[PDB]
């Protein structure tokens, strides 16, 4: 639930 996390799959 990190607002700065990458929102793509498995990168």
């Amino acid at each position, epitope marked *: *639930a*990190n*607002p*700065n*996390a*990458n*929102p*793509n*799959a498995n*990168p």
Partner: antibody
């Protein structure tokens, strides 16, 4: 040929609502998160919202928090941005941008043409 | 919230000259996560540099990125006629991604 096509822009009265669309193609839409970035007339760029690749998480900017709602539909390769209770400072060109390769962070590697939202009476 | 300051405001150079743009952050950008964008009037921004130094796909070699911590630099070795536009720097090391005010490189005559 990664292209993002915006639609839904137009004139909207202050306080009313407007729904934007972003139809994607040229890449696997369900494997990438998509942003919304706006640019006020004569001003700079400002990040608005983001949605995960699977639509699980949706984070916004403090300027639009509680008023804008980002959603997607991976079957139709389409992104949405429901804008409610629009204000004068919301007048801008809205781009939908694809998320970039990173371990943690939001940068925009491919943009769209952008659609103009004019909040005026 | 990190604020990005770009200098100079407007850069007046001639084609073939060397261009250097500065981006100054109020806080240290983690992992040197700074991007650079090009934007011409009426057109959308496009990505040039990501990760402060890695070059985006389809970007010429004259574009170069460097810097870390709080000071960054975009460098165009030999300015081409299609390189005159507004350049924005963006950091993605904090919860809200933030842009600079933009540096404009202008044709000198």
């Amino acid at each position: 040929q990664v292209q993002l096509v915006e639609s839904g822009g137009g004139v909207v009265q202050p306080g009313r609502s407007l729904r934007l669309s972003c139809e994607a193609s040229g890449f696997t839409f369900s494997s990438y998160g998509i942003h919304w970035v706006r640019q006020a007339p004569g001003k700079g760029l400002e990040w608005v919202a983001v949605i995960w690749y699977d639509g699980s998480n949706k984070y916004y900017a403090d300027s639009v928090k509680g008023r804008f709602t980002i959603s997607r539909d991976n079957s139709k390769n389409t992104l949405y941005l429901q804008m409610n209770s629009l204000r004068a400072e919301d007048t801008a060109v809205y781009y939908c941008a694809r998320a970039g390769y990173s371990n943690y962070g939001h940068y925009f590697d491919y943009w769209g043409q952008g659609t103009l939202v004019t909040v005026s009476s | 919230e990190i604020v990005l300051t770009q200098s100079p405001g407007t850069l007046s150079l001639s084609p073939g000259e060397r261009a250097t743009l500065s981006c100054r952050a109020s806080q240290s950008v983690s992992s040197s996560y700074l991007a650079w964008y090009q934007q011409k009037p009426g057109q959308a921004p496009r990505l040039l540099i990501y990760g402060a130094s890695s070059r985006a796909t389809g970007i010429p070699d004259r574009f170069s990125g460097s810097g870390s911590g709080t000071d960054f630099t975009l460098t165009i070795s030999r300015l081409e006629p299609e390189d005159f536009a507004v350049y924005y720097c963006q950091q993605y090391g904090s919860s809200p991604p933030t842009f600079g005010q933009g540096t404009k490189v202008e044709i000198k005559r």
